[PDB]
């Protein structure tokens, strides 16, 4: 009854924003960024190589003090590394071998993991008994998880492949709010530096801003073709970058709802698996399927380096808070700390 | 460095324990299940004995451990968790050969699974769990395959016989089976082999076909590591 009538009006509404977006579009940063000295070739080599994993690596997360990090794999083991002396602080055995995400609490007392079992688990690192044990169980998602992120020490944000993202309360264990409005599987998520807003990347060629307290989809951005694999906040709080299966990265802005740059090359055809900035919004490290990472340039859209020390597909990469090191996981079952 | 020398000692006690876990984990072999609602995946395992979609059944034959990764409740899209299963030794696929209407979409699943970018090394073990229904359906003659499949005007039995029974039933069995095999023999390059089989709901010796075909899957890769092929 109302399906046909409402569809016609919906299409007109989209065109009004599209015309407004086109009208509001003034210029492009490609021409403006022509009066800046190029960064030049950037070369880094491994300083450490973390051995001990016996399966493909899915995700990793750095620490607050830029010395400790955690990683997960198909081995079903969660490992905390000392990136300085290559020592192993802890080795946490997971409950389900199929996991896709990791997190490290800002205070440093907790970690998190989740995956195909539709649960994000919480572990207490600093206990009196001298062992690491699970403290909170978080269930209530009908699809596999893709990203868990702590807010301060007691609120975690989760995005799964069931079209919805939810905000939790660790102490009580119930969803305080629920965020919905997507269409397909959600793959990536990133919290703002001020921990007030966050974005989400779905398998819909669409990404949406959010408000944590209320639960209202503030904005919606489209433009990609295939699914969206990775998302991350620019270290200012006004932008974010999305990595899709089109072998293309592109930069969004929160005051324009339009793309600014697109990082692509004819030779590059393989898809993108991870994206993260580094401490200045000047280097954009992307991890592709063609057996190596890639160091982009978020202002000039040109290549500046390759992390070609890996012999398999790179699935994760992160950068320290201090901006010192850059780890990188892949399917070699090896973790390499570059600099 | 007195405290630092003791920290580096537990890191090597952890390494000793992690390597032990890798020795006990490579003893087993990994398997999948794909099929339809009425295909009969569950009944195959039973004869050989919340939202947790992974059933994860286990069975034993000939002193070799097997783990079968029955994943269910996978929403609507499948192409996002297959890439997590690209390390198994074989994929088990079940087809309803009885329901003629639900056969063109049985080939649809096979064609796309046979051509995954993440499943370009794993060889499929094709199954056909419905065999007794075909014999009873052709004898009763409720419907004719010609309307669904108008290819009997150019097909005949190519000098094959299986026990004896009605040759009318056997020629019907072969047309469906060679329909699936003809899809397979278009992209494999020695790294893919289908192993089609005919099974019923009473058949119990299913586990040998998984076991015997797992020798060839591993034998054919020992001939490749040695540069013999």
């Amino acid at each position: 009854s109302e399906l046909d009538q409402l569809r016609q009006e919906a299409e007109q509404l989209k065109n009004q924003i599209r015309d407004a977006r086109k009208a509001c579009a003034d210029a492009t940063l490609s021409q403006i960024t022509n009066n800046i000295d190029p960064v030049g070739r950037i070369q880094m080599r491994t300083r450490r190589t973390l051995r001990g994993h016996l399966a493909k690596i899915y995700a990793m997360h750095w620490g607050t003090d830029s010395r400790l990090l955690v990683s997960a794999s198909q081995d079903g083991k969660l490992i905390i590394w000392d990136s300085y002396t290559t020592n192993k602080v802890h080795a946490i055995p997971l409950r389900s071998s199929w996991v896709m995400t990791c997190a490290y609490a800002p205070s440093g007392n907790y970690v998190a993991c989740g995956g195909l079992d539709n649960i994000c688990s919480i572990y207490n690192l600093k206990t009196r008994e001298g062992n690491v044990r699970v403290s909170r169980e978080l269930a209530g998602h009908t699809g596999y998880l893709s990203c868990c992120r702590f807010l301060d020490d007691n609120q975690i944000v989760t995005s799964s492949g069931d079209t919805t993202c939810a905000l939790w309360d660790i102490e009580t264990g119930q969803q305080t709010t629920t965020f919905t409005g997507h269409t397909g599987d959600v793959m990536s998520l990133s919290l703002a530096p001020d921990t007030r807003l966050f974005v989400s990347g779905a398998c819909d060629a669409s990404a949406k801003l959010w408000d944590v307290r209320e639960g209202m989809c503030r904005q919606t951005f489209t433009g990609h073709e295939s699914d969206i694999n990775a998302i991350c906040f620019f270290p200012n709080g006004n932008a974010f970058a999305t990595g899709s299966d089109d072998a293309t990265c592109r930069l969004f802005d929160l005051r324009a709802d339009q793309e600014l740059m697109t990082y692509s090359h004819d030779n590059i055809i393989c898809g993108i698996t991870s994206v993260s900035f580094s401490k200045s919004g000047r280097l954009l490290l992307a991890g592709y399927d063609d057996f190596n990472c890639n160091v982009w340039d978020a202002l000039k859209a040109d290549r500046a380096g390759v992390l070609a020390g890996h012999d398999n597909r790179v699935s994760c990469l992160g950068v320290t808070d201090d901006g010192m090191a850059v780890a990188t996981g892949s399917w070699d079952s090896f973790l390499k700390i570059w600099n | 460095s007195a405290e630092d020398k003791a920290a580096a000692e537990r890191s090597k006690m952890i390494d000793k324990n992690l390597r032990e876990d890798g020795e006990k984990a490579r003893r087993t072999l990994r398997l999948l299940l794909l099929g339809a609602d009425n295909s009969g995946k569950s009944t195959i395992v039973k004869q050989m004995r919340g939202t947790s979609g992974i059933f994860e059944t286990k069975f034993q034959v000939d002193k070799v451990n097997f783990h079968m990764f029955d994943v269910g409740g996978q929403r609507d899209e499948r192409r996002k968790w297959i890439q997590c299963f690209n390390d198994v030794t074989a994929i088990i696929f079940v087809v309803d050969s009885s329901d003629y209407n639900r056969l063109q979409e049985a080939l649809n699943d096979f064609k796309s699974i046979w051509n995954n970018r993440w499943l370009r090394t794993i060889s499929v073990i094709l199954f056909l769990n419905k065999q007794d229904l075909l014999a009873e359906k052709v004898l009763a003659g409720k419907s004719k395959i010609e309307d669904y499949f108008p290819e009997f005007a150019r097909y005949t039995t190519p000098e094959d016989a299986t026990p004896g029974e009605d040759p009318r039933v056997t020629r019907a069995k072969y047309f469906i089976r060679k329909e699936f095999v003809d899809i397979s023999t278009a992209s494999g390059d020695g790294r893919h082999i289908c192993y089609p089989h005919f099974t019923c709901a009473v058949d119990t010796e299913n586990a040998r076909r998984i076991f015997n075909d797992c020798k060839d899957i591993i034998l054919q890769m020992n001939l490749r590591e040695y540069n013999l092929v």
Partner: single-chain antibody
Amino acid sequence: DVQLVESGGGLVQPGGSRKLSCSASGFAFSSFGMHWVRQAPEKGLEWVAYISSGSGTIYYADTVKGRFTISRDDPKNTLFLQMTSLRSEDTAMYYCVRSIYYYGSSPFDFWGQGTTLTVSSSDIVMTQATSSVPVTPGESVSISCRSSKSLLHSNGNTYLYWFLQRPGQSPQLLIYRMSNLASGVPDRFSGSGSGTAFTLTISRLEAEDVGVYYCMQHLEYPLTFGAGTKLEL
């Protein structure tokens, strides 16, 4: 809860033998190192031995090298010390201590109740210059130790520890790397120093602060305590 209970004391002739034992409970007694510490009657504290997790590396005090033996039984959850040919200087009170060594851990957390043994009739030296101090509640008191060598390492740590031996009690951690404060004590306590000279700092004193202050180094395994510093109202 965590509790170390130990026994095995008594009277020993000058030349006999004796064996002590701890009883670890309430914690994973498979990832912690272990120690022993003496206390001569109305004197300080001194080491007896050491053993790590997995019984890998052992160290001994030079005073009793080749005469004492320390053994471990992980499934039994019990530590052992065997003494041979006891002398007349071995009359003291023995303590059981746990220690875990990884990045950020606090060694020497828990101390045992203690047993008394009686017998019938190149190193970093630290001296506590001050012996006794009369204190009043509500004031600030600074307590210092002196070091023979600088404890600062190339890492950046400074292996200095502090302990509280209240009357009829056992020592407990306050500060374990001259800066960091162990969990379970009020924030009024503090510690500071640089290389050679060290000092404590207490803001507001209460009634239950009377005892003896001890200081530690953790650089060279022949580890040595300090003298006594008594605080009295």
